[PDB]
Design an enzyme around this catalytic site. Sequence first.
Site, PDB file in Angstrom:
ATOM      1  N   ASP C  91       0.873  -1.291   0.091  1.00 55.79           N
ATOM      2  CA  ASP C  91      -0.029  -0.039   0.045  1.00 55.79           C
ATOM      3  C   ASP C  91       0.977   1.040   0.115  1.00 55.79           C
ATOM      4  O   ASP C  91       2.136   0.921  -0.414  1.00 55.79           O
ATOM      5  CB  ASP C  91      -1.150  -0.025   1.121  1.00 55.79           C
ATOM      6  CG  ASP C  91      -2.420   0.781   0.905  1.00 55.79           C
ATOM      7  OD1 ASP C  91      -2.159   2.126   1.333  1.00 55.79           O
ATOM      8  OD2 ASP C  91      -3.270   0.030   0.695  1.00 55.79           O
ATOM      9  N   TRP C 126      -9.553  32.821 -11.460  1.00 57.44           N
ATOM     10  CA  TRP C 126      -8.954  31.765 -10.599  1.00 57.44           C
ATOM     11  C   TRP C 126      -7.696  32.265  -9.990  1.00 57.44           C
ATOM     12  O   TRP C 126      -7.358  31.625  -8.702  1.00 57.44           O
ATOM     13  CB  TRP C 126      -8.749  30.483 -11.389  1.00 57.44           C
ATOM     14  CG  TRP C 126      -7.488  30.345 -12.067  1.00 57.44           C
ATOM     15  CD1 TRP C 126      -7.307  30.997 -13.334  1.00 57.44           C
ATOM     16  CD2 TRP C 126      -6.364  29.885 -11.830  1.00 57.44           C
ATOM     17  NE1 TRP C 126      -5.920  30.652 -13.842  1.00 57.44           N
ATOM     18  CE2 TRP C 126      -5.368  29.986 -12.821  1.00 57.44           C
ATOM     19  CE3 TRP C 126      -5.937  28.847 -10.582  1.00 57.44           C
ATOM     20  CZ2 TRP C 126      -3.979  29.312 -12.895  1.00 57.44           C
ATOM     21  CZ3 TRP C 126      -4.656  28.284 -10.866  1.00 57.44           C
ATOM     22  CH2 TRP C 126      -3.783  28.476 -12.021  1.00 57.44           C
ATOM     23  N   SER C 157      -3.398  17.947  -1.164  1.00 61.89           N
ATOM     24  CA  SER C 157      -2.362  17.809  -2.059  1.00 61.89           C
ATOM     25  C   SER C 157      -1.028  17.733  -1.305  1.00 61.89           C
ATOM     26  O   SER C 157      -0.054  17.100  -1.561  1.00 61.89           O
ATOM     27  CB  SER C 157      -2.553  18.685  -3.305  1.00 61.89           C
ATOM     28  OG  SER C 157      -3.369  18.272  -4.028  1.00 61.89           O
ATOM     29  N   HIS C 240       2.905  29.071 -11.473  1.00 61.86           N
ATOM     30  CA  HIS C 240       3.737  28.442 -12.579  1.00 61.86           C
ATOM     31  C   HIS C 240       3.831  26.957 -12.340  1.00 61.86           C
ATOM     32  O   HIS C 240       3.507  26.050 -13.152  1.00 61.86           O
ATOM     33  CB  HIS C 240       4.958  29.066 -13.090  1.00 61.86           C
ATOM     34  CG  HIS C 240       5.330  28.270 -14.219  1.00 61.86           C
ATOM     35  ND1 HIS C 240       4.912  28.393 -15.558  1.00 61.86           N
ATOM     36  CD2 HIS C 240       5.966  27.110 -14.172  1.00 61.86           C
ATOM     37  CE1 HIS C 240       5.358  27.608 -16.479  1.00 61.86           C
ATOM     38  NE2 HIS C 240       6.057  26.737 -15.663  1.00 61.86           N
ATOM     39  N   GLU C 242       2.213  24.912 -10.369  1.00 59.48           N
ATOM     40  CA  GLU C 242       1.066  24.484 -10.536  1.00 59.48           C
ATOM     41  C   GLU C 242       0.690  24.029 -11.988  1.00 59.48           C
ATOM     42  O   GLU C 242       0.061  22.835 -12.098  1.00 59.48           O
ATOM     43  CB  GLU C 242      -0.356  25.210 -10.404  1.00 59.48           C
ATOM     44  CG  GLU C 242      -1.688  24.724 -10.581  1.00 59.48           C
ATOM     45  CD  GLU C 242      -1.976  23.392  -9.748  1.00 59.48           C
ATOM     46  OE1 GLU C 242      -2.961  22.799  -9.865  1.00 59.48           O
ATOM     47  OE2 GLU C 242      -1.058  22.981  -8.846  1.00 59.48           O
ATOM     48  N   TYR C 244       3.169  22.948 -14.321  1.00 56.20           N
ATOM     49  CA  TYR C 244       3.975  21.643 -14.379  1.00 56.20           C
ATOM     50  C   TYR C 244       3.419  20.495 -13.520  1.00 56.20           C
ATOM     51  O   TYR C 244       3.481  19.341 -14.074  1.00 56.20           O
ATOM     52  CB  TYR C 244       5.482  22.186 -14.075  1.00 56.20           C
ATOM     53  CG  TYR C 244       5.820  23.143 -15.125  1.00 56.20           C
ATOM     54  CD1 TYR C 244       5.969  22.773 -16.534  1.00 56.20           C
ATOM     55  CD2 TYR C 244       5.871  24.451 -15.063  1.00 56.20           C
ATOM     56  CE1 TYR C 244       6.220  23.503 -17.399  1.00 56.20           C
ATOM     57  CE2 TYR C 244       6.175  25.430 -16.006  1.00 56.20           C
ATOM     58  CZ  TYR C 244       6.210  24.774 -17.392  1.00 56.20           C
ATOM     59  OH  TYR C 244       6.665  25.759 -18.322  1.00 56.20           O
ATOM     60  N   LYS C 319      11.756  15.000 -24.159  1.00 57.27           N
ATOM     61  CA  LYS C 319      10.536  14.068 -23.851  1.00 57.27           C
ATOM     62  C   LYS C 319       9.793  13.789 -25.137  1.00 57.27           C
ATOM     63  O   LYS C 319       9.688  12.597 -25.413  1.00 57.27           O
ATOM     64  CB  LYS C 319       9.826  14.453 -22.685  1.00 57.27           C
ATOM     65  CG  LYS C 319      10.207  14.660 -21.386  1.00 57.27           C
ATOM     66  CD  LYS C 319       9.431  14.928 -20.386  1.00 57.27           C
ATOM     67  CE  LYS C 319       8.743  13.404 -20.060  1.00 57.27           C
ATOM     68  NZ  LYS C 319       9.927  12.537 -19.813  1.00 57.27           N
ATOM     69  N   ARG C 438      -9.413  38.847 -22.629  1.00 53.29           N
ATOM     70  CA  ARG C 438      -9.822  37.690 -21.671  1.00 53.29           C
ATOM     71  C   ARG C 438     -10.669  38.398 -20.804  1.00 53.29           C
ATOM     72  O   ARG C 438     -10.615  39.573 -20.346  1.00 53.29           O
ATOM     73  CB  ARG C 438      -8.710  37.100 -20.827  1.00 53.29           C
ATOM     74  CG  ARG C 438      -7.483  36.326 -21.644  1.00 53.29           C
ATOM     75  CD  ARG C 438      -6.506  35.794 -20.622  1.00 53.29           C
ATOM     76  NE  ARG C 438      -7.030  34.821 -19.494  1.00 53.29           N
ATOM     77  CZ  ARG C 438      -6.269  34.290 -18.777  1.00 53.29           C
ATOM     78  NH1 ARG C 438      -4.977  34.454 -18.860  1.00 53.29           N
ATOM     79  NH2 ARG C 438      -6.920  33.390 -17.904  1.00 53.29           N
TER      80      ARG C 438
END
EC number: 7.1.1.9
Lengths: 79, 98, 514, 84, 259, 43, 227, 46, 58
Positions: C91, C126, C157, C240, C242, C244, C319, C438
Site C-alpha cells: 500500500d 482563478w 495535496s 507556474h 501548478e 507543471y 521528452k 480575456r
Amino acid sequence: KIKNYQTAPFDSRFPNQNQTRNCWQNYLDFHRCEKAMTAKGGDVSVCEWYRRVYKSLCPISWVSTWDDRRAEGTFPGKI
Amino acid sequence: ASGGGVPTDEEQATGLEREVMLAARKGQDPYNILAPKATSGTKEDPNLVPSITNKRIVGCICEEDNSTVIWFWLHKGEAQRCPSCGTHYKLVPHQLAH
Amino acid sequence: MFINRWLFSTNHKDIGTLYLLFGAWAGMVGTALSLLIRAELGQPGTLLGDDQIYNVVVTAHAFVMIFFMVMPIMIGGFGNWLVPLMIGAPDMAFPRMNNMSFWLLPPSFLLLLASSMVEAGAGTGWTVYPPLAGNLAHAGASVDLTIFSLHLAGVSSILGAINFITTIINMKPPAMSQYQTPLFVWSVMITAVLLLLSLPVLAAGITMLLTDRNLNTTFFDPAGGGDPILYQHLFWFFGHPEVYILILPGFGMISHIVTYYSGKKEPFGYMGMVWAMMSIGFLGFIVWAHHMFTVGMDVDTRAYFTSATMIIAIPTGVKVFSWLATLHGGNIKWSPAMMWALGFIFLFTVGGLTGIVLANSSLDIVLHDTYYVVAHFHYVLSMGAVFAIMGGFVHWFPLFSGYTLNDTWAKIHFAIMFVGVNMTFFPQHFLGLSGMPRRYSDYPDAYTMWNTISSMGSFISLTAVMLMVFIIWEAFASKREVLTVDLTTTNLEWLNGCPPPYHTFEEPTYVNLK
Amino acid sequence: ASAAKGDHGGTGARTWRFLTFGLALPSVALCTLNSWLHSGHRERPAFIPYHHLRIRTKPFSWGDGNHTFFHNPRVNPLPTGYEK
Amino acid sequence: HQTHAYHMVNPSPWPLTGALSALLMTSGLTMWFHFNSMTLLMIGLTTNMLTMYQWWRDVIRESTFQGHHTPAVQKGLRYGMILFIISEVLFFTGFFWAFYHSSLAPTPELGGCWPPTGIHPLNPLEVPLLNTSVLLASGVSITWAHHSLMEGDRKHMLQALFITITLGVYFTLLQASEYYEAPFTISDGVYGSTFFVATGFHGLHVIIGSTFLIVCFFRQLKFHFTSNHHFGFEAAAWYWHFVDVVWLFLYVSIYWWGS
Amino acid sequence: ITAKPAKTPTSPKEQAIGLSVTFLSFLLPAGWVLYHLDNYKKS
Amino acid sequence: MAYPMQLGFQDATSPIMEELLHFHDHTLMIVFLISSLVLYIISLMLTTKLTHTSTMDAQEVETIWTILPAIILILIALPSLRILYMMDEINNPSLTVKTMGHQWYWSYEYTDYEDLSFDSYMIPTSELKPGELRLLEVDNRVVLPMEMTIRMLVSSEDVLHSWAVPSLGLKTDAIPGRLNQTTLMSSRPGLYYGQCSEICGSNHSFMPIVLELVPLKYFEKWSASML
Amino acid sequence: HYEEGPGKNIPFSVENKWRLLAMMTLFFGSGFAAPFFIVRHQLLKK
Amino acid sequence: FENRVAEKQKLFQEDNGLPVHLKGGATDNILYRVTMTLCLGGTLYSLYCLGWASFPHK
Ligand SMILES: CCCCCCCCCCCCCCCCCC(=O)OCC(COC(=O)CCCCCCCCCCCCCCCCC)OC(=O)CCCCCCCCCCCCCCCCC
Ligand code: HEA
Ligand code: HEA
Ligand SMILES: CCCCC/C=C/C/C=C/C/C=C\C/C=C/CCCC(=O)O[C@H](COC(=O)CCCCCCCCCCCCCCCCC)COP(=O)(O)OCCN
Ligand SMILES: CCCCC/C=C\C/C=C/C/C=C/C/C=C\CCCC(=O)O[C@H](COC(=O)CCCCCCCCCCCCCCCCC)COP(=O)(O)OCCN
Ligand SMILES: CCCCCC/C=C/CCCCCCCCCC(=O)O[C@H](COC(=O)CCCCCCCCCCCCCCC)COP(=O)(O)OC[C@@H](O)CO
Ligand SMILES: CCCCCC/C=C\CCCCCCCCCC(=O)O[C@H](COC(=O)CCCCCCCCCCCCCCC)COP(=O)(O)OC[C@@H](O)CO
Ligand SMILES: CCCCCC/C=C\CCCCCCCCCC(=O)O[C@H](COC(=O)CCCCCCCCCCCCCCC)COP(=O)(O)OC[C@@H](O)CO
Ligand SMILES: CCCCCCCCCCO[C@@H]1O[C@H](CO)[C@@H](O[C@H]2O[C@H](CO)[C@@H](O)[C@H](O)[C@H]2O)[C@H](O)[C@H]1O
Ligand SMILES: CCCCCCCCCCO[C@@H]1O[C@H](CO)[C@@H](O[C@H]2O[C@H](CO)[C@@H](O)[C@H](O)[C@H]2O)[C@H](O)[C@H]1O
Ligand SMILES: CCCCCCCCCCO[C@@H]1O[C@H](CO)[C@@H](O[C@H]2O[C@H](CO)[C@@H](O)[C@H](O)[C@H]2O)[C@H](O)[C@H]1O
Ligand SMILES: CCCCCCCCCCO[C@@H]1O[C@H](CO)[C@@H](O[C@H]2O[C@H](CO)[C@@H](O)[C@H](O)[C@H]2O)[C@H](O)[C@H]1O
Ligand SMILES: C[C@H](CCC(=O)O)[C@H]1CC[C@H]2[C@@H]3[C@H](O)C[C@@H]4C[C@H](O)CC[C@]4(C)[C@H]3C[C@H](O)[C@]12C
Ligand SMILES: C[C@H](CCC(=O)O)[C@H]1CC[C@H]2[C@@H]3[C@H](O)C[C@@H]4C[C@H](O)CC[C@]4(C)[C@H]3C[C@H](O)[C@]12C
Ligand code: CUA
Ligand SMILES: [Cu+2]
Ligand SMILES: [Mg+2]
Ligand code: NA
Ligand SMILES: [O-]
Ligand SMILES: [Zn+2]
C-alpha cells in the site's frame, strides 16, 4: 533657466516603468523648498521646477490627498 | 549517574517489530528487508526464491544498471528462466514463520 | 461493511477509485461551466448578464477543471492505483492519512459551490487578484469561501505529496534503485515535490488576502503601505509550478502508453526522460513573473524571465523526441489509448510552442490578457492534460474494473473530442493576435466569426463528454471479463490480474542484486 | 566565532546538562534581569490620525468591531484617538 | 498473512472526521466573519481536537502496544516529518517575502521610510532578546533530554523535557505580554500586518510544538519510549528546532533589521 | 488484450436506450434552464 | 482596430509595433516548422510494418535533440531582446499624459501646463451614431499630437485595470498606489482603439480606449478648448 | 473479508444494467446540471 | 510510577478482531459516537447555514 518647459525630462534616479517615487520625490522637494523660503521671506519662484515636474507626473487625486493631509497634520513624509 | 528507568527494545519491543529484531539477531530475513544476493543462475545453480505459497513474482535486473525490470510469476516446480536473459530461478516453498 | 470500506478506507486501490469518481463528477461540473462560457460568447450581445455572473462561471470553470478534475484524477486516481503496484508495495506509506487527502476534496468543492450561491459569487478569475477580490469590490462571503476551498484543496495535496514522496522513496523492493522505477512513478514523485514547495506559498498568499478582507491587514492595500503586485508574486510563485504539476503525471502516463502500444519493453532514453522531468520541475520554480510582463517590471527582470521561461523548451523537447523514438520500429497497436497519446504528442507540442511565443516579454505586451494565452493553455490542458487522462483511463480501465470497453465506441469518442477541442481553441489564436481581451462577456463585432466557430466546437466536445458516459455504462452493462494482457514482463501493475486483489504484494516481489 | 569553550567529550547527556545549567539558563536569567530593569510604562506618543494606521476596511468580528484583539487602552488609540 | 515489514492500517473513521472538521472550521470562520455567529466554528474546533486525539492515540496503540513500527515503518515516518517541516518552511517563506517586499520599498503612504511614520517599534534588546535566549535555551535542554533517553536515564529525560516545556510556556506568556503592551496593532498598515501575522503564526507553532513535547512528556511518564525507539520524541525535537530557527529569522528580520 | 464474451450482452436496442437516456440526462435540465433564461432575468 | 475574420496583428501604427510584427513572423516560421516537423515524424514512425523492438542506444542522438533546440532558442532570444531594450532605451517625450482606470471608465489628465482632465465612457449601443462601432466608441477621445514622443503614465483609483492599444503595441497595467510609465509615438493621424485588459468587475468588457492622433496645432487648440 | 473481482471493487452495484443506468444518470446528470441551477439561482435574485 | 506497557500490549493484541480505534473497550465506542455525532450534525448545520446564506435578508 530651462523654462521652455514642455514636460518633466528623463531623471536617471528613476529610469524604470514604476515612476511613483519620481512624482513623490518632486512633490516633497517643492513643499520643502517652499517651506525654506516663506521662512527667510525669499522667493517661492526658486521652487518652480519641482512644482512643474510633480504637476506633470502626479495624479491629481494624489496631489489633492497629499495637500489635504499637510493641512490636516497627517502627511507622513518629512517637510 | 544514569538511574536507568528506560526500557530497551529487548525488554519491551513486541509484535512484528520484535519478530524483525529477533530474526535479525539470528541472521534471518523473513520480512524481506534485504536484497537477496544472486547465484550464477545456471540450471545447476538456480537463484533460490523463498515463498510462503506455490508462486512468487520475480523482478530480474538482467544486467547491472538496467533501468528496465523483467517481472514474471515463479511457480513451485522445475526452475523457470527470465524471459529476457534466461537466468534461472527456483521457488523454495516453506510455511510462514507465524 | 460498505462504510468501513468506502468511508473508512486504508486501501490504495479503493481510494484511487474514490478519486476517479470524484474527478469524473468534477469534469461534468467543469464541462457545464465551459458550455455557459461559450453560450455567452456564441453570438454577439449579452445572454446571462454582465461581467460578474460571467466571470463567476469563468472562475468556477478553472477551479473545477484544475483542483477537482485534473489533480484528483491524475494524482489521487492513477497515482494511488498504479504507484504502489508499479513498485510491488503492499500500500502507500500513510494509508489512513491517504484517506483524509481524499475526504478533504468534497468539502473543498462544497465551499466552491457555496461561494457561487452566496451574494453574487466570486467573479475574480482563478488568480483572485486584489483589489477586485478585496472586501470593497467583492464585499461578502463569496471570496472568503473561495479562499477556504483552496486551503482544503491545498492541505489535501500537501499531505498527498508527503505520502507519494515517502512511499516512492521508502517502499520499493530493497534491490530497486530510483533508476529502476518506471517513469510514471518518477512523474508522481517530481509532481509531489512541486506540490510540497509551491502550495504552502499560495496558502500564505490567500491567507494574507483573508486577513486584508477580515482583520484589517494591508498586505496588498496601498493605504497601509501594501502592494497588489505582492499577491501576484506569491500567487504565481505557486501558479507556474501548478501548471507543471498539471502536466508531469501526464508525461508519465504518455511514456507508458507510447511504450506499451509500440510493443516496446521500455521507453527510449530512460535517464534522459528522468533528467528532463527533473529539469522541468526545477526550471518551473524560477520563471513565475512571465505571468507579470505588463505590471511594470524593470527591463533586466523582463529579460531574465524571458530567457529562463524559454530554456524549459530543451528538456521538454527531449521528452517529445524520446516519445517519437519509442514509436520508431514499434509493432504499433492503434488502440484508443494510443490515439489519445499520439494526439497528446502533437497538440501538446503546439501548445508548448505558443507558450514560447508568450515567453518573449516584447510580444507578451500585445498577447497578454488576450485569447492567445487562452489558446496556449487550452492546447496544453484541454488537449494535453485531458488527452493524457483519456489515454490512461482507456488503457487502465480493464485493470481497475476487470471489464473491457468497446474499442470502436472509444475510437469514435476520440474522433468527436479531437474535432471538438481543435474547433474550440484553434481560432482563439486569431482572436488573440487581433486583440480580444480575456474575461469579456461580449466582444466588438469584428470578433464574431471566430467566437461563433469556437462556441460550435465547444458543443462537439459536449457530445464527446456525453458519449464517454455511455461508453463506461456499456462496459459495466456488458461485463466482458479480461483474460490476457501482453507485456506484463514490463508492466508490473497488470501482473496480479484484473482487478487485482484488495491486498497485493502481501508477499513482496523477489529482486536480487547480481 | 564569538564563542570559545573546549570539547566536553565525556558522554553526551552530561555535557548537554552542563550546557543547560552552565550557559542556557544563566543567559535566560541575565536576559530576565536586563528586561525586568528596562521595563516600566513609558511616555505614550501624541495621537496623529495618520491614514496608513488604525486601518478599518471592515469591522472586527468581536466587540464593537472597532477594537483590535489585544487592545490596550494605554497605548492603542482608536481611529478617533485614545480612549477616556 | 504478510512477509513484508510495512503497516496495513485498520479501517479508520478519523480521516473522515478530520475532513468534516476542516469543513466545520472553514465554514465556521465564514459564519464568524460575515454572519456574527461562532457556533459552527466552536463545533469544528471540538471535532478537530477529538479527531487529532483519537488519531494519534491509535498511532501509539499501533506502535508501543501492537509493535507495527518496524525499522521500515520508522524510516517512512522520518521522511514524513522532514517533508511536513519543509512544507512549513515554505509557508513562513511567504510571510518573509511579504515582510521584505513592504520594508525594502516603503510606499509614499508610509512616508517613503521603514519603519513607517507613526510606528515606534519594540526594542529588540528587551523582551525580544529574552525570547531569543529562552528558545535557544530550550534547544539545549531538548538535546540533553534526547541524550538522557538514549543513555537509559529516565529521571534526567523527564527533567530536561520539563525545562524545555517550561521555556516554551515562558516564551508564549512573554509574547502574549508583548502583544498586549505593543503600541501598534495588526491594523497599523503593513508594519502591523507583517509583524502580527508572521510572529502570530510562529506563536501558534510554539503552542503546537509545546503541546507535542507535553504529549512526549506523559508518554515518557508511562514508559512508552525505549532507549532506541522514540520517534515521537525525535519528531517533536525536529519540530521544536524548526520553531527555534523560524524565531531567529523573525528576530533578525522583523525585530532587528526591520526596526 | 483478450476478454470473455459479454456475460450480459447489450444489444443495439439496449445501447440505443442507454445512449438516449444518457444524452437526455445532460440536455433536458440544461435545456429547461437555458429556455427559461428570459423568465429569470424579469422576475 | 480589428476587422472581421482577422487572423494576425492589427496593422502597425508605431515603429515598435512594426518591429513586433517582423519578430512574430520570425518566431511563427519557427513554430510552423517545428510543429509540422513533429507531425511529419509522428506519421513517419506510424507508416511502416518494419520493426526494431530491441534496446536502442540513446547518446549520439540526445546531443542533436539538445544542441539544435538550444540554437533555435538563441535565434529567437537575440531579436526578442534587441526589441525589449529598444522599447526601453531613453527617448525624450515632448508631452506627459496620465490615465486613471475606474469602474468602469478611464479618466485622462494632461497637466504639463493647464489643469486639463476629463472622463472617457463607452458610447452605449442604443446611442451609437450611424457607422460607430459597438463596444469601442467613447464620449471623449484621448486627443494626442501625431509624430511625437508622448509619456503615458497609468494608474487606477480602485481595482486593477490595464490600459491597452494593440495598434501601438501598448499594454500597461493600471494599479492603485502605482504610476506605470510607457511611451507612445503614432507615425500616422487617425483613431486607435483598445480595451480594458484586466478583469475589474461588472463592466470590464465595456470601458474602451480611443486615441485621436492629429497635428500639434489641432492638438493645442483642442486642449485650450477642453479647460 | 470484502468482495473481490469484477463489479465488486466499486461503491456502486453493476448487478442490474438498468439500475446502474439510473445511478450513472443521477451521478453525471447532477454534476452537469449544477452550474445551470446556480446561474438560475443567481438570476432569480436581483 | 510503574511500567504497565506489557498489560496494554496484551489488551491491544487480544485476538477479538476489533479495529485499533475501538480495541480499548466501551469508552472508544462512546467517544467515537460523540465525534461522529458532532461531525455529521455539524455538517447538516453547515448545509442549513449555506442554504440560509444563499438567499437575501433585511
Ligand atoms: C484560414 C481559416 C482556418 C479556420 C479553421 C478553424 C477550424 C479548426 C481546424 C484547423 C485547421 C487549420 C487551418 C490552417 C491554419 C492557418 C494558419 C494561418 O494562416 O495563420 C496565419 C497567422 C496570421 O498571420 C498573418 O496575418 C499573415 C498571413 C496573411 C494571409 C495570407 C493571404 C490570405 C488572404 C486572406 C487573409 C487576409 C490577408 C491580409 C491580412 C494581412 C495580415 C495581417 O495566424 C496565426 O499565427 C495563427 C496562430 C498559429 C499558431 C499555431 C501554430 C501552428 C500549429 C499547427 C501546424 C501544423 C502543420 C500542419 C501541416 C498541414 C497538414 C494538412
Ligand atoms: C484543466 C483545465 C481546463 C480544461 C480541461 C478546460 C477546458 C475548456 N475550457 Fe477552460 N479555462 C481554464 C482551464 C481549463 N479549461 C482556466 C484555468 C481558464 C482561465 C480562467 C480565468 O481566466 O480566471 C480557462 C478559461 C476559458 C475561457 C476564457 C474565459 C474568458 O476569458 O472569458 C474559455 C472560453 O472559451 C474556456 C473554454 C473551455 C472549453 C470550451 C473547454 C472544453 O475543452 C471542455 C470540454 C470537456 C472536457 C475536456 C471534459 C473533461 C472531463 C473529464 C476528463 C471527466 C472524465 C473523467 C474520467 C474518465 C475519469 N476556458
Ligand atoms: C499543462 C499546463 C501548462 C503547461 C505544460 C504550460 C507550458 C508553458 N507555458 Fe503556459 N500557461 C498555462 C498552462 C501551461 N503552460 C496556463 C493555465 C496559463 C495562464 C494562467 C492564467 O493566466 O490564467 C499559462 C500562461 C503562460 C504565459 C503567460 C502569458 C500571459 O498571461 O501573457 C507564458 C509566458 O511565458 C506561458 C509559457 C509557457 C511555456 C514556455 C511552456 C513550456 O513549458 C512549453 C514547452 C514545450 C515546448 C516548447 C514544445 C515541446 C518542445 C519541442 C518540440 C522542442 C523544440 C521547441 C523549441 C526549440 C521552441 N504560459
Ligand atoms: C522560567 C525559567 C525556567 C527554568 C526552570 C528551571 C528549573 C530547574 C530545577 C533545578 C533542580 C535540579 C536538580 C535537583 C536535584 C535532583 C537530582 C538529580 C541530580 C543527579 O542525580 O545528579 C547529581 C548532580 O548534582 C550536581 O552536582 C549538579 C547539579 C545540577 C542541577 C542543579 C543546579 C541548577 C541551577 C540552575 C540555576 C541557573 C540560574 C543561574 C543564576 C546565576 C548566574 C550566574 C549527581 O551527579 P554527579 O556525579 O554530580 O554528575 C554525574 C551526572 N549526574
Ligand atoms: C501569542 C501567541 C498567540 C496565540 C493564539 C491565541 C489566540 C488567537 C490567535 C491565533 C493565532 C493565529 C495566527 C495567524 C492569524 C492571524 C493573526 C493573529 C495574530 C495575533 O494575535 O495578532 C493580534 C490580533 O489578532 C487578531 O486580530 C486575530 C484574532 C484571531 C482571528 C483568527 C484568524 C483565523 C484565520 C487564519 C486561517 C488559517 C489558515 C491556515 C492555512 C493552513 C495551511 C494550508 C495582535 O493584537 P492587536 O490588538 O492587533 O495588537 C496588539 C496591540 N496591543
Ligand atoms: C533574493 C533577495 C533579493 C534582494 C534584492 C536583490 C538585488 C539588489 C542589489 C543589492 C542587494 C541588497 C539591497 C536590497 C535591494 C532591494 C531590492 C528591492 O527593492 O526589491 C523589492 C522586493 O524585494 C523582495 O521582497 C525580495 C524577495 C523575493 C524572494 C524571491 C523568492 C525566493 C523563494 C525561495 C524559497 C527557498 C527558501 C529556503 C529556505 C532557506 C521591491 O523592488 P522595487 O525596487 O520596488 O522594484 C524592482 C522590481 O522591478 C523587482 O523586480
Ligand atoms: C483555516 C482552516 C484550514 C484547516 C484545514 C486543516 C485540515 C484538516 C484538519 C484535521 C487533520 C488533523 C488530524 C490528524 C492528522 C494526523 C496525520 C498523521 O499523523 O499522519 C501520519 C503520516 O504523516 C506524517 O507522519 C507527518 C505528517 C503530519 C501532518 C499533520 C496534520 C497536518 C494538518 C495541517 C496541514 C498543514 C499543511 C502545511 C502548510 C501550512 C501517520 O500516518 P497514518 O496513515 O495515519 O498511519 C500510518 C501508521 O503506520 C502509523 O502507525
Ligand atoms: C487551532 C488548531 C491548531 C491545532 C492545535 C494543536 C494541534 C496539535 C498539537 C501537537 C500534536 C502532536 C501530537 C503527536 C503525537 C502522536 C503520537 C506519536 O508520537 O506517534 C509516534 C509516531 O510518530 C508519528 O506518528 C509522528 C506524528 C507527527 C505529528 C506532527 C504534529 C505537528 C502538526 C500539527 C498541526 C500543524 C498545524 C499548522 C498550522 C498552520 C509513535 O511512535 P514512537 O513514538 O516511536 O513510539 C513507539 C515506541 O513506543 C515503540 O517502542
Ligand atoms: C547557537 C547554537 C544553538 C544550539 C541549539 C541546539 C543545537 C542542537 C545541535 C545538534 O545536536 C547534537 O550535536 C552534537 C554534535 O556535535 C552531539 O553531542 C554529543 O556527542 C557525544 C555523544 O556521546 C558526546 O561525547 C559529546 O560530549 C556531545 O557534544 C549530539 O549527538 C547531537 O544531538
Ligand atoms: C487555524 C485556527 C484558526 C481558528 C482561530 C480561533 C479564533 C478564536 C476566536 C475567539 O473569539 C472570542 O470569544 C468570545 C465569546 O466566547 C467573543 O465574544 C464576541 O462574539 C459574540 C457573537 O455572538 C458577541 O455577542 C459578543 O458581544 C462579542 O464580544 C470575544 O469577543 C472573542 O475575542
Ligand atoms: C448548454 C448545453 C445544452 C443545450 C442543448 C440542449 C437542448 C436540447 C433540448 C433539450 O431540452 C428541452 O427543450 C424543450 C423545447 O423544445 C423545452 O421545453 C419548453 O418548450 C416546450 C415546447 O417548445 C414546452 O412544451 C415546454 O413546456 C417548455 O418547457 C424543455 O424544457 C427543454 O428541457
Ligand atoms: C450536534 C452538532 C450540531 C448541533 C446543532 C447545531 C446547533 C444549532 C444552533 C442554531 O442556533 C443558532 O445560534 C446562533 C448563535 O449561537 C444564533 O445567532 C445569534 O448569535 C448571537 C448569540 O451569541 C446573537 O447575538 C445574534 O443576534 C444571533 O444571530 C442563530 O440565530 C442560530 O442559527
Ligand atoms: C549522467 C546522466 C545519467 C547517466 C546514467 O547514470 O545512466 C545523464 C542522463 C541524462 C543526460 C543528459 C541528457 O542526455 C540531456 C543532455 C544531452 C547532451 O548530449 C549532453 C548533456 C545532457 C544534459 C546529458 C548529460 C548526461 O549524459 C545525463 C545527465
Ligand atoms: C514521579 C517521578 C519519579 C518516579 C518515576 O520515575 O516514575 C519524577 C521523575 C522526574 C520528576 C519531575 C521532574 O523533576 C521535573 C519537575 C520538577 C519540579 O520540581 C516538580 C515537578 C516535575 C515535573 C517532577 C515531577 C515528578 O516528581 C517526576 C516526574
Ligand atoms: Cu477595467 Cu477591465
Ligand atoms: Cu507560468
Ligand atoms: Mg493582466
Ligand atoms: Na455575450
Ligand atoms: O505556463
Ligand atoms: Zn533477466
